[PDB]
Write a protein that binds this ligand. Structure first.
Ligand SMILES: *[C@@H]1O[C@H](CO)[C@@H](O[C@@H]2O[C@H](CO)[C@@H](O)[C@H](O)[C@H]2NC(C)=O)[C@H](O)[C@H]1NC(C)=O
Ligand SMILES: *[C@@H]1O[C@H](CO)[C@@H](O)[C@H](O)[C@H]1NC(C)=O
Lengths: 483, 77, 75
């Protein structure tokens, strides 16, 4: 009897595929609801009318600043407690804890007070890094399990009992990472649905809210230097706000429940008791001992640039250039165009599989670089509605570059390290450095310009990637050993 | 402002002779609500009977309960 | 600065220098990060934090917090 094992392995492969799909869907849904709520709060809490009639003597800007601080600073302390937490709960349970903390943060925006928003922001900043760490580790582990299942089904006795792939799981990991990043980028588009369906119809034209903007673009001198005091024409009824927040809470609840139920268990407690053979007095120092690795000293600038570029695409293009010609009427449209461009770039990078590994990466390092040039010389006049497709195509190309960069980084990190602990540590370091870059951009706000720093960082990243490639081809043969 | 929301309601549904109710008694603020007449005012800004706190409390309780239940299920296998 | 430079001489003994160079540069960067596993540090670190807190509270908290009430910047 051989058809029984065939059907068993096919069902296991289908289960792995649907688990990856459900994990990606839940991650993108919670990221989208979080981004939408954050954008709605940032737009609604920047006006004298709403702040003075709903709260007044409550310190709303102070609350917003404290929330931003607790979100952008706490990841630093989150690094110190993420390895033991991700290895104590598990690879999937960490995602559930993270989406639960995200739902808690979404719920804490109902009453909107200090003692309920500060701890929620602290928890969100504490869980933002372990969320991405567990997500990447789970994606890589499920891709490796898919590959070894397929290779054990097609090769029974030819496949070794230990270490099957030998670096042959790239076509099976890239296909999963492509759809994962496509969903993660469509999350940015889904985040703009509440603003379009409820917030885009309550703000007046740009003739009054974009009046004190004498110069923008290259002469930014800050995130938002010139801007009107109010932005809402009419005040939204509490019924609409409460119903849209209830819809957001319900969709976050659905995302969390689909993450919890449609994932099952892919941990194998044998791996748990094998990991417990290492101890707790060494796991706290393992990521600090992996600093002596040679590839990290050149991949860290790559991660810092990834964080810088994602935070510049989230704010620098929408609030720096897309706000000049058009006001807040077409900001969500610019974001959805960026999201569609990134989703197309996901499949574009998926198509580039026959070529070797470091082909699109440096290619990306050029394309958006060209955009940087366009972001350095060209400066759009704010008080004219002459050209609108230039911002659209710029956002599309920047999203393409960002998505291909992200998928190439993830594929490189998945193919460079294959051990479970190795992948966990690499993803933890990557996400810690991404959070550090986010915090640096947060501190780098209200500055003159951030394009020169961007081009310097991307040049250093291209140089470091070329150096790492040319030294890996010459067979350096260096790797740390900390079992 | 909404600080005395029922005041905004009191001018809407009450039969008391108040002349010049739509052109003379105006609003000094705040911001976009300057020059507004008191009879043409309707402010749903302030939350009504405290159901927002009930909903928030219920949501955080459901979230923490699901978290605790799933952690206990993972601990108990 | 001149009395520190001149009235100190030299108390290094280059033999100790060449002995310290036998350790290397790729390990001295991690030595203080490896001494975290020491047992006495985990209890002496709060002592140091309190020392810093108390010296900065004596520099500012008593002069600019209590000594400024009754008398101004005269005393
Ligand atoms: C924000 O926009 C309002 C208009 O929407 C500006 O108010 C105008 O101010 C000028 C300057 O004196 C007056 O001549 C206009 O009559 C005002 N318009 C009104 C009252 O509708 C306001 O100055 C802007 N503020 C900032 C900081 O840009
Ligand atoms: C309102 O904005 C439009 C945008 O094209 C402009 O054409 C029009 O002149 C503006 N109206 C003013 C400034 O009164």
């Amino acid at each position: 009897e051989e058809e029984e094992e065939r059907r068993y392995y096919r069902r296991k492969r289908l289960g792995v595929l649907k688990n990856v799909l459900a994990a990606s869907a839940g991650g993108m849904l919670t990221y989208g609801v979080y981004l939408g709520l954050l954008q709605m709060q940032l737009i609604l809490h920047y006006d004298e009318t709403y702040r003075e009639v709903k709260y007044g003597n409550m310190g709303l800007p102070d609350i917003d600043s404290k929330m931003l601080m607790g979100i952008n600073v706490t990841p630093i302390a989150a690094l110190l407690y993420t390895p033991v937490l991700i290895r104590f709960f598990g690879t999937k349970w960490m995602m559930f804890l993270a989406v639960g903390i995200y739902a808690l943060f979404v719920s804490t925006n109902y009453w909107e007070r200090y003692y309920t928003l500060v701890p929620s922001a602290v928890a969100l900043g504490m869980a933002i890094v372990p969320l991405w760490a567990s997500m990447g580790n789970y994606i890589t582990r499920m891709a490796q399990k898919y590959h070894e299942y397929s290779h054990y089904k097609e090769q029974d006795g030819q496949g070794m009992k230990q270490r099957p792939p030998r670096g042959s799981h790239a076509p099976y990991l890239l296909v999963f990472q492509a759809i994962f990043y496509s969903f993660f980028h469509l999350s940015f588009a889904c985040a703009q649905l509440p603003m379009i369906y409820f917030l885009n119809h309550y703000l007046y034209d740009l003739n009054h809210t974009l009046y004190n903007v004498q110069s923008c673009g290259t002469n930014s001198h800050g995130i938002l230097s010139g801007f009107n005091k109010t932005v809402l024409r009419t005040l939204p009824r509490s019924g609409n706000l409460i119903v849209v927040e209830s819809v957001l809470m319900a969709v976050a609840f659905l995302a969390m429940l689909l993450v919890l139920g449609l994932c099952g268990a892919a941990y194998r407690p044998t791996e748990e008791i094998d990991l417990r053979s290492v101890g707790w007095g060494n796991i706290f120092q393992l990521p600090f001992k992996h600093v002596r690795d040679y590839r990290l000293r050149h991949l860290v600038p790559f991660f810092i640039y990834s964080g810088f570029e994602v935070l510049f695409a989230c704010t620098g293009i929408a609030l720096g250039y897309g706000v000049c010609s058009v006001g807040l009427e077409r900001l969500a449209y610019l974001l959805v165009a960026y999201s569609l461009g990134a989703s197309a770039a996901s499949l574009l990078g998926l198509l580039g599989l026959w070529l070797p590994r470091p082909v699109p990466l440096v290619a990306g390092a050029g394309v958006h670089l060209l955009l940087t040039f366009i972001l350095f010389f060209w400066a759009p006049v704010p008080r004219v509605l002459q050209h609108s497709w230039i911002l659209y195509v710029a956002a599309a190309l920047w999203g393409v570059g960002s998505a291909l960069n992200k998928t190439g980084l993830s594929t490189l990190l998945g193919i460079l390290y294959e051990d479970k602990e190795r992948q966990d540590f690499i993803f933890t370091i990557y996400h810690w450095w991404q959070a550090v870059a986010i915090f640096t951009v947060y501190l780098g706000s209200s500055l003159h310009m951030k394009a020169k720093l961007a081009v310097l960082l991307v040049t250093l990243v291209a140089a470091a990637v070329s150096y790492l490639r040319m030294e890996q081809k010459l067979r350096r043969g260096v790797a740390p050993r900390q079992p | 402002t909404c600080d005395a929301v029922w005041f905004v309601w009191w001018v809407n549904h009450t039969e008391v002779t108040i002349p010049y109710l739509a052109t003379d008694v105006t609003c000094v603020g705040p911001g976009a609500h300057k020059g507004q007449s008191v009879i043409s005012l309707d402010l749903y800004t302030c939350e009504l009977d405290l159901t927002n706190l009930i909903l928030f409390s219920l949501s955080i309780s459901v979230s923490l309960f699901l978290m605790v239940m799933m952690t206990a299920s993972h601990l108990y296998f």
